[PDB]
Amino acid sequence: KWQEVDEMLRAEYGGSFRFSSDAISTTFTTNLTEYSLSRVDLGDCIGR
């Protein structure tokens, strides 16, 4: 775990999600489809 963002704004545009955080001044870009956690090897910390 790296960052906890209490205000993350998600916007849909051009087939992409943009997750913006004013607190840390950061915009992440993801695809629309979710990432299944089963693809992570030994990633049991993520959910909890």
Binding site: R18, S20, S25, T26, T27, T29, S38, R39, V40, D41
Partner: protein, 68 residues
């Protein structure tokens, strides 16, 4: 099943945030200016009609671009 690899540099996303913020503000303000400009020209057409009645020579010389 695989491991996600992470870049050491977050500054690309911070540049993205700053650019998006500035770009949205500037685009919104300049679109507002564009709308106001178009409305003002459409609004001033009335004054131009009346001045056209008052003095056809000057109005035509100014609108045409050549003195007539």
């Amino acid at each position: 099943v695989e491991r996600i690899k992470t870049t050491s540099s977050i500054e690309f996303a911070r540049l993205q945030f700053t650019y998006n913020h500035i770009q949205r503000h500037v685009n919104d303000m300049l679109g507002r200016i564009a709308v106001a400009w178009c409305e003002l020209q459409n609004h001033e057409l009335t004054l131009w009609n009346e001045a056209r009645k008052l003095n056809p020579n000057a109005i035509a010389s100014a609108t045409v671009g050549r003195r007539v």
